[PDB]
Design a protein around this ligand. Structure first.
Ligand SMILES: CCCCCCCCCC(=O)N(CCO)C[C@@H](O)[C@@H](O)[C@@H](O)[C@@H](O)CO
Ligand SMILES: CCCCCCCCCC(=O)N(CCO)C[C@@H](O)[C@@H](O)[C@@H](O)[C@@H](O)CO
Ligand SMILES: CCCCCCCCCC(=O)N(CCO)C[C@@H](O)[C@@H](O)[C@@H](O)[C@@H](O)CO
Ligand SMILES: CC(C)NC[C@H](O)c1ccc(O)c(O)c1
Ligand code: NA
Lengths: 119, 290, 106
């Protein structure tokens, strides 16, 4: 199970970006894909997450601006980030929580991809 | 063979105490293991441990010596303790199935819904019901049958057979086993259905390009699910089936088989550590403790 | 190695006798009592030392059978120091019978 992350880079404040994480490997039908981020000298926090049954979960800092969705066929998750601010600058990580064990969850983490927003 | 039976009891006690002590230690000592699911596992491990420490030893000696050596009061107290711990254990397996159901199907809902305080109340209730099925009826003689040959075993301190009226045998068996079982079948069946229907949506997504097949992760989920329901039912259905049978046509099932089937149920308490503590974090903690 | 018992020798051959002794109660009329006869002749060789096989004809020696309450035949009573430790009734095969004997010889 490898998580390939793309769509990050440099962008001006007020701009948009579309992150995209494709998960190539064996994953249980029921799973939760999401985007976390880590600002410089801060703890890793949740940005957005989407369950395999359409349920979503956002953080208040990104509510109304960021939109998470997943590809219907393959295991790929997109995060459309609009109205970006310099606060959003972080290393965004892709996450897959696999529920195939039934009794516990297994985590997969991507390498991380830099997003940097300037004013 | 008669010597093989006594050896086989010793390892059963060893597996139960060893396994469960090790689990409770692992959860208590590690910050990472202290999740809500493992809170219900801690309830389960306590019950199973009390089975290994108190219930199975005294039960073993009733088979070895052919008679109760500790009197009428400790027969009643021990019978109550047996039913308490078996009720709490099996009901806790049912609560775990529901916990995993919520965390798998509706994970964002589950976080706000299932708080630490709510989990404690659930656990307290499981034990309170176990007490009111075990200690309240057995100590107060509500479990007692009016039959003369049954009433011989209540009068005799040396006799500590399990003889109940119709009402108690049914009600106790339902509360300890059948309500839990049906909830576990219903609950875990929807995890299979959820995963089946999700494979259906992924196939509709493709536009007739690909047909999904059962991979590694789906076959492991089915094996785990097969172990959960298979081992629990193998261990306790035979005893609890017979326990209802014996009320109606008493001589139909022998006494040696009734006792042996009950011991099969005590073995589940040794299996439960193995099934419900295979997480990577459990495996790491176990290595750290040894 | 089969002991062929009588009414008078029973006390000396079974109750006073050393080790475990398996007694077969057989009759010349009973077809189930004949089915086990060649099986017990084979067991006497393989279980030599571990136990001793004995046969008692109920038509020849009717006095012994009422004392222990024999209902049907063949009925196999295992004896240990002049005491009945086990019982089987009816015809068995060698594989079934060995598992009864192996478990009671502890
Ligand atoms: C006879 C045993 C009686 C005690 C049964 C255990 C109750 C405590 C279970 C537990 O570990 N909790 C923390 C969760 C619930 C408070
Ligand atoms: C958190 C509190 C939740 C409720 C606590 C009480 C639930 C259990 C009620 C109850 O006691 N029983 C079911 C109702 O009978 C089981 C037995 O008490 C009863 O079956 C026997 O006493 C008779 O069968 C004996 O003749
Ligand atoms: C990869 C191995 C896949 C195994 C999947 C099948 C497991 C069957 C387990 C089982 O024993 N039961 C569930 C039947 O589905 C029986 C219970 O229903 C019982 O309560 C009656
Ligand atoms: C030997 C006896 C004390 N075993 C009792 C058995 O474990 C049992 C537990 C809970 C019940 O509800 C029950 O009917 C029977
Ligand atoms: Na008694």
């Amino acid at each position: 199970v490898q998580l390939q992350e793309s769509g990050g880079g440099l962008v001006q404040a007020g701009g948009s970006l579309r992150l995209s994480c494709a998960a190539s490997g064996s994953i249980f039908s029921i799973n939760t894909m999401g985007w976390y981020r880590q600002a410089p000298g801060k703890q890793r926090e949740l940005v957005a997450a989407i369950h395999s049954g359409g349920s979503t979960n956002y953080a208040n800092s990104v509510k109304g601006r960021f939109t998470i969705s997943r590809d219907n066929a393959a295991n790929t998750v997109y995060l459309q980030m609009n109205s970006l601010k310099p606060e959003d600058t972080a290393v965004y990580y892709c996450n897959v929580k696999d529920y195939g064990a039934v009794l516990y969850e297994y985590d997969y983490w991507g390498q991380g991809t830099q997003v940097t927003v300037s004013s | 063979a008669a010597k093989v039976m006594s050896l086989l009891m010793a390892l059963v006690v060893l597996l139960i105490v060893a396994g469960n002590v090790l689990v409770i230690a692992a959860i208590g000592s590690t910050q990472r293991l202290q999740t809500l699911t493992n809170l219900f596992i801690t309830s389960l491990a306590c019950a199973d441990l009390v089975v290994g420490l108190l219930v199975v030893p005294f039960g073993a000696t009733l088979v070895v010596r052919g008679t109760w050596l500790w009197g009428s009061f400790l027969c009643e107290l021990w019978t109550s303790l047996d039913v308490l711990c078996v009720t709490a254990s099996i009901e806790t397996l049912c609560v775990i199935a529901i916990d995993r159901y919520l965390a798998i199907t509706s994970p964002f809902r589950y976080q706000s819904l299932m708080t630490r305080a709510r989990a404690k109340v659930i656990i307290c209730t499981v034990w309170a019901i176990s007490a009111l099925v075990s200690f309240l009826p057995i100590m107060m003689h509500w479990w007692r049958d009016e039959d003369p040959q049954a009433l011989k075993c209540y009068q005799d301190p040396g006799c500590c057979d399990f003889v109940t009226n119709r009402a108690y045998a049914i009600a106790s068996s339902i509360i300890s086993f059948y309500i839990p079982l049906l909830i576990m079948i219903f609950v875990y069946l929807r995890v299979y259905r959820e995963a089946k229907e999700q494979i259906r949506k992924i196939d509709r997504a493709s536009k007739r390009k690909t047909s999904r097949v059962m991979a590694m992760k789906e076959h492991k989920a089915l094996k785990t699910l097969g172990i959960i329901m298979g081992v629990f039912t193998l261990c306790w259905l035979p005893f609890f089936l017979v326990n209802i049978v014996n009320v109606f046509n008493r001589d139909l099932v022998p006494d040696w088989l009734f006792v042996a089937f009950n011991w099969l149920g005590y073995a589940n308490s040794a299996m439960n550590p193995i099934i419900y503590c295979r997480s990577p974090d459990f495996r790491k903690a176990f290595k750290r403790l040894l | 190695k089969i002991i062929h018992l009588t009414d008078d020798s029973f006390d000396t051959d079974v109750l006073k006798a050393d080790g475990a002794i398996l007694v077969d109660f057989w009759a010349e009329w009973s077809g189930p009592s004949k089915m086990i006869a060649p099986i017990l002749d084979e067991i006497a060789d393989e279980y030599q030392g571990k136990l001793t096989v004995a046969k008692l004809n109920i038509d020849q020696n009717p006095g012994t059978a009422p004392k222990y309450g024999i209902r049907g035949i063949p009925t196999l009573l295992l004896f240990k120091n002049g005491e009945v430790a086990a019982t089987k009734v009816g015809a068995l095969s060698k594989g079934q019978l060995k598992e009864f004997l192996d478990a009671n010889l502890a």
